[PDB]
Design a protein around this ligand. Structure first.
Ligand SMILES: Cc1cn(-c2cc(NC(=O)c3ccc4c(c3)C[C@H](Nc3cncnc3)C4)cc(C(F)(F)F)c2)cn1
Length: 297
């Protein structure tokens, strides 16, 4: 943790359960007069007498030593991350049970669900420059993580949350949602990996770097431009995805690239292809990616 004191528990008014997991639950709560509890570098846009909505992740009160240790590890990592496009840890309750971590609340859910409910410009719609701005926010969030020497290792639209006015917050749900079980591949009956988003060198040698995050961003950019209508490499089985990673390693031109999304102009698709360069050093840094997406595209 980075908060010096526990967030006062009595200031969280329960509104609604947001989900239940093996280790606990997530509650939507209200906080009255939050100015004295909320860090000054975080925006408060509440009318007089209106409360701030926050998300509270609560660890089961009978959790194991291990699950409790995992929970506190997640708290410490989140306490470091202060950026307009990264989920924010607003407070914690860790001096007594049950353990709690309080995040800002992104009322529109994860980005994959959000884009699925939009059509390209009926129901709710979204246009090409708005999709560029979504991806630019992700790139901006990732550029910040890179400056911390922090490797996300699971960037994908399912791990981005959407607030008001299309604001994007990068997050990490872990691998704890049945909805996305198909996006992970179990290796030798133990760990689970997001192979369709991983660079060939993550698949084959287990090396995770900002450079492989750049690769993942390219797949995530492809998702955004597809409006999340299709799993990346959907035509390939998991074993074919792993074989495709062999083809990248051999670089004989038999490797398979994701196709240009219909809404994607050629110059932008060419930028995506550079995120999948075989050499880590030839992938563009996030600073270059954000510049292109916020301006040149
Ligand atoms: C060991 C470890 C931990 N992390 C890590 C952990 C995180 N954790 C989260 O993103 C997180 C935490 C708590 C809650 C949620 C998400 C959903 C829910 N709030 C919610 C709000 N609004 C709408 N729905 C739901 C409660 C994030 C990251 C980040 F930022 F780097 F990506 C990294 C990496 N390694």
């Amino acid at each position: 943790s980075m908060p010096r004191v526990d967030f006062p528990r009595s200031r969280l008014r329960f509104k609604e359960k947001l989900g239940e997991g093996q280790f606990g639950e997530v509650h939507l709560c209200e906080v009255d007069s939050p100015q004295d509890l909320v860090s000054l570098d975080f925006p408060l846009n509440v009318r007089k007498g209106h409360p701030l909505l926050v998300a509270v992740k609560i660890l089961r009160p009978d959790a194991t030593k291990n699950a409790r240790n995992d929970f506190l590890k997640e708290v410490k990592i989140m306490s470091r991350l202060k950026d307009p496009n990264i989920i924010r840890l607003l407070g914690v309750c860790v001096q007594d049970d049950p353990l709690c971590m309080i995040t800002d609340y992104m009322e529109n859910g994860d980005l994959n669900q959000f884009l699925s409910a939009h059509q390209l410009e009926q129901g709710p719609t979204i246009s090409y420059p708005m999709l560029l701005h979504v991806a630019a926010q992700i790139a901006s969030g990732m550029r910040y993580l890179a400056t911390l020497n922090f490797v996300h290792r699971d960037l994908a639209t399912r791990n981005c949350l959407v607030g008001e006015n299309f604001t994007i917050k990068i997050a990490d749900f872990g691998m704890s949602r049945n909805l996305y079980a198909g996006d992970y591949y179990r290796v030798q009956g133990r760990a689970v990996l997001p192979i369709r988003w991983m660079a060939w060198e993550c698949i084959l040698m287990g090396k995770f770097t900002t450079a492989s995050d750049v690769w993942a961003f390219g797949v995530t950019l492809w998702e955004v431009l597809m409006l999340c209508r299709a799993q990346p490499f959907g035509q390939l089985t998991d074993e074919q995805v792993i074989e495709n990673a062999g083809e990248f390693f051999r670089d004989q031109g038999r490797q398979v690239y994701l196709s240009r999304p219909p809404a994607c102009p050629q110059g932008l698709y060419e930028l995506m292809l550079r995120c999948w360069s075989r050499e880590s050093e030839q992938r563009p840094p996030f600073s270059q990616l954000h510049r292109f997406l916020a301006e040149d595209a």
